[PDB]
Design an enzyme around this catalytic site. Structure first.
Site, PDB file in Angstrom:
ATOM      1  N   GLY A  44       0.032  -3.972   3.781  1.00 59.56           N
ATOM      2  CA  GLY A  44      -0.264  -5.268   4.091  1.00 59.56           C
ATOM      3  C   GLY A  44       1.071  -6.146   4.240  1.00 59.56           C
TER       4      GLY A  44
ATOM      5  N   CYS B  69      -0.491   2.380   6.663  1.00 61.90           N
ATOM      6  CA  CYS B  69      -0.430   0.974   6.978  1.00 61.90           C
ATOM      7  C   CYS B  69      -0.210   0.349   5.667  1.00 61.90           C
ATOM      8  CB  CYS B  69      -1.382   0.364   7.838  1.00 61.90           C
ATOM      9  SG  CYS B  69      -3.199   0.339   6.605  1.00 61.90           S
TER      10      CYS B  69
ATOM     11  N   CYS C  91       0.774  -1.181  -0.033  1.00 58.93           N
ATOM     12  CA  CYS C  91       0.115   0.006  -0.006  1.00 58.93           C
ATOM     13  C   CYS C  91       0.871   1.264   0.122  1.00 58.93           C
ATOM     14  CB  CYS C  91      -1.054   0.136   1.282  1.00 58.93           C
ATOM     15  SG  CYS C  91      -1.447  -1.627   1.592  1.00 58.93           S
TER      16      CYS C  91
ATOM     17  N   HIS D 142      -8.949   3.679  -2.658  1.00 55.92           N
ATOM     18  CA  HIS D 142      -7.329   3.344  -2.508  1.00 55.92           C
ATOM     19  C   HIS D 142      -6.731   2.338  -3.634  1.00 55.92           C
ATOM     20  CE1 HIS D 142      -4.031   1.800  -0.611  1.00 55.92           C
ATOM     21  NE2 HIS D 142      -4.412   0.664   0.089  1.00 55.92           N
TER      22      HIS D 142
END
Lengths: 386, 400
Positions: free
Chosen positions: A374, A372, A91, A341
């Site tokens: 993954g 954050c 991300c 996103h």
């Protein structure tokens, strides 16, 4: 203000569209990326061959989109003499691309380059060890990100109502921001085709973020079914929408920007990447932000805007509370719950949204971009507006 | 470059230099039929990460970052690489990312960790490359054919070998001579033990076609074939093109392998008492026409030398990747390199070319040879890159 500083010259992004059903559902990622590369070069009137490198963040394409990205470059008539690579830190990949161009400049490889992020989640589709299950943290890397949302909500006690309150605020801020024209400088219109009844491509031009839904109400959010878990609190309404989009950012050594007469939109001051349990990957910004601030020589009180990615309201809300951030400073134009996103794009996208808001305010200021990641990470970057 | 004190190979030794502490690689095996044909790339990458940390006795949580070069996995292997970290018991607090600049990905991993150090992000990190070609295009626009250079990015790399052989007039005999030398040098180097320090044995399983699973330990590069002769190479069929000169014999073999390299800010290495195997002095990446991508090193090398402040004469070893003998031979002649300095232990025609690994692998092979020689020296690692690029890095080995 050193001659060696890595400065952000300019950035542009596409509108962000909902995956599968939106305006970019039939548009390949190379086309999205080409539009933004082209726009950034034209806007500052940089000869394409002045680019020392192009770095593209991307998560879901084979090989992280290296062939696709190179093809985009050529779609933008950027010459073969300009090299390109891709990066995947999930991300954060879009912000990672910024850090990697910065790194190349600081290595003496070149003085100027382009950092991009792109993702077509509309067109989205490892070889792993047989003893995955002997290693709990390896196993945990296969936990769906939506389940990590629920884990974060339970471990750290973030209620449904907390989550929904967060999401309605992100939607409402996004709606006002769009109406005031806050996204008009940064978005480049993209003309593409979408498929119809009888197979024929039909032309359209996308100028606006599709996921900003002013019709969102608190009653409507409370009614939604859980998206990942039987008795869960994560929903489509309090999560980021799966999306297609691109963003491109031009960075330079300060002395090179000055030599060529290029604007300085911002200056990169710090970049921090930390690891957290993949289980509760959403807590990343809570640990990335303090390290980034330390490195840039700052405290939470010195920052004007924190762009903290809203993958899910659970994790975003937790991070705001854990860090004791003044809420009015967090995502003042809304975030990913409203904006969407597109995995590899979001990091670069944030930088553009951040700096354009600092620019409008017109005061010397610091801003943070953080998300954050993954498989259990957090990244944070500190930028200074002039 | 033009300042008062400049002297082409003057020593420099700042507290900020990015140094190579140590490195290890797997042996390289032939794809599909070799010892690693049934081994997933996370396992290959775990073995080398584990080995590098153990070798220098670094606490894993001292790593600020891990960067893994990879070409053929989905998303360039980010999920896979992170899993490999945990297979090595490297804790979650250490972050990881992947990078893809095609054949240079492994060296790109080194440049990206170097860059993170330069950014102030961390003081120490691990640069890796891996590829399981035994086990591994995208969504592309509909108007590919309206743009010739886009079209050219789908040209098979084997066909770019032929293109380079025809444009620049590199004979079949030239190519075979090159490949025999690479094989012969590789066999001697293996016999002398040149690869013993750098290779870490890997213990894995292979599935036999009887439906039986068996444990094996791979300690040696499978592609080094001392039985290669000139006669044998001259008899081989073309691999990509009817009247071509590129063959399986004068090409790199499709392969499986990993490599890991530990890099640090000099001041951090010295704080921790870590060895310095080499120092990174320059990194150059340039673009060339995709259709003749093989010429990359001919344009990457001069730039890297200029940046490091060197001329071709100042360099003791050039590790130039041998994707294809055509392209490698062209690059040596164009640059007028003394041949004895090029791939002295043999290159990819003999060792193999697991795409994402090679760049990292080259660094380790180069530095271990400079270390053996034990003189202060400069070495170059360079390779051509699919879709039309070249990369080159300059490294300094201390000593005398």
């Amino acid at each position: 203000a050193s001659a060696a500083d890595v400065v952000v010259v300019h950035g542009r992004r596409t509108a962000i569209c909902r995956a599968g059903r939106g305006g970019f559902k039939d548009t390949t990622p190379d086309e999205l990326l080409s539009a933004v590369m082209t726009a950034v070069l034209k806007d500052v009137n940089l000869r394409p061959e002045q680019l020392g490198d192009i770095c593209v963040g991307n998560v879901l394409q084979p090989g992280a989109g290296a062939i696709m990205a190179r093809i985009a470059q050529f779609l933008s008539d950027i010459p073969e003499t300009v090299p390109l690579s891709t990066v995947n830190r999930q991300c954060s990949s879009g912000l990672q691309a910024v850090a990697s161009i910065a790194g190349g400049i600081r290595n003496g490889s070149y003085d100027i380059g382009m950092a991009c992020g792109v993702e077509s989640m509309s067109l989205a589709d490892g070889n792993i060890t047989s003893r995955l299950m002997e290693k709990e943290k390896a196993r945990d890397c296969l936990i769906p990100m939506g389940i990590t949302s629920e884990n974060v909500a339970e471990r750290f006690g973030i209620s449904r109502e907390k989550q929904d309150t967060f999401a309605l605020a992100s939607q409402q801020k996004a709606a006002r921001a769009q109406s005031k024209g806050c996204f008009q400088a940064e978005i480049v219109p993209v003309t593409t085709t979408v498929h119809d009844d009888k197979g024929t491509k039909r032309s359209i031009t996308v100028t606006q973020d599709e996921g900003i839904r002013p019709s969102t109400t608190m009653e409507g959010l409370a009614k939604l079914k859980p998206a990942f878990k039987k008795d869960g609190s994560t929903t489509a309404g309090n999560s980021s929408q799966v999306s297609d989009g691109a963003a491109a950012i031009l960075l330079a050594r300060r002395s090179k920007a000055e030599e060529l007469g290029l604007p300085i939109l911002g200056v990169l001051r710090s970049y921090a990447v930390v690891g957290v349990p993949p289980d509760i990957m959403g807590i990343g910004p809570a640990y990335a932000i303090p390290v980034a601030l330390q490195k840039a020589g700052l405290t939470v009180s010195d920052v004007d805007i924190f762009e903290i990615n809203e993958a899910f309201a659970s994790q975003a809300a937790y991070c705001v509370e854990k860090l004791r951030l003044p809420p009015e400073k967090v995502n003042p134009l809304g975030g990913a719950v409203a904006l969407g996103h597109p995995l590899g794009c979001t990091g670069a996208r944030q930088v553009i949204t951040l700096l354009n808001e600092l620019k409008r305010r017109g005061k010397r200021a610091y801003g943070v971009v953080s998300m954050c990641i993954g498989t259990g990470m957090g990244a944070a970057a500190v930028f200074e507006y002039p």
